[PDB]
Write a protein that binds this ligand. Structure first.
Ligand code: HEM
Ligand SMILES: [Xe]
Ligand SMILES: [Xe]
Ligand SMILES: [Xe]
Length: 154
């Protein structure tokens, strides 16, 4: 699969808004993920103790984690599909250390889309959401292929 330049521009234009406050967006995305799919929280040794949205919002380490994750994803999106080098260390760590199944990456993608739809109706109409879906699908497809090379069915 290949996104058009126009599709990449829809992705990058909503990402520009995320970058006004990446920390706030990261909190919202993690909170949505953990509420919609509580099982995902179990993968985080450092965060699995958090009991409520209030506790999640108050967690400085969770905030920092959200910034790290969204910055790494942003770097990937800015490559517009040319992300082989960026994907290698992520695929290895998530396959082998963190043990994150592709289904959890799907849940995370769903959380991103939900938050962008909520926060950014001005840059996340139907065409833009379709472009972001395509970009995240591409990312997951490429991660899944690397998972397989790395010896992880996940
Ligand atoms: C776009 C998708 C994702 C990106 C770009 C991403 C990125 C990152 C980065 C950059 C790190 C720190 C470096 C590393 O260990 O590789 C990390 C750590 C981690 N990731 Fe992900 N991640 C994604 C999805 C997920 C999902 C869906 C889960 C679980 C449901 C997950 C679980 C973890 C865990 C448990 C750590 C270690 C956290 C800690 O240090 O406390 N990741 N991720
Ligand atoms: Xe996040
Ligand atoms: Xe990942
Ligand atoms: Xe993703």
């Amino acid at each position: 699969m290949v996104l058009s330049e126009g599709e990449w521009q829809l992705v990058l234009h909503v990402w520009a808004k995320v970058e006004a406050d990446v920390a706030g967006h990261g909190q919202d995305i993690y909170i949505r993920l953990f509420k919609s799919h509580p099982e995902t929280l179990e993968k985080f040794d450092r965060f699995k103790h958090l009991k409520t949205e209030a506790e999640m919002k108050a967690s400085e380490d969770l905030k920092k984690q959200g910034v790290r994750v969204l910055t790494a994803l942003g770097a990937i999106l800015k490559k517009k599909g040319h992300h082989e080098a960026e994907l290698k260390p992520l695929a290895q760590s998530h396959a082998t250390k963190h043990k994150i199944p592709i289904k959890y990456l799907e849940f995370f993608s769903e959380a991103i889309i939900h938050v962008l739809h909520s926060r950014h109706p001005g840059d996340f109409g139907a065409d833009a959401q379709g472009a972001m879906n395509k970009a995240l699908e591409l990312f997951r497809k490429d991660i899944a292929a690397k998972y397989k090379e790395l010896g992880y069915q996940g």
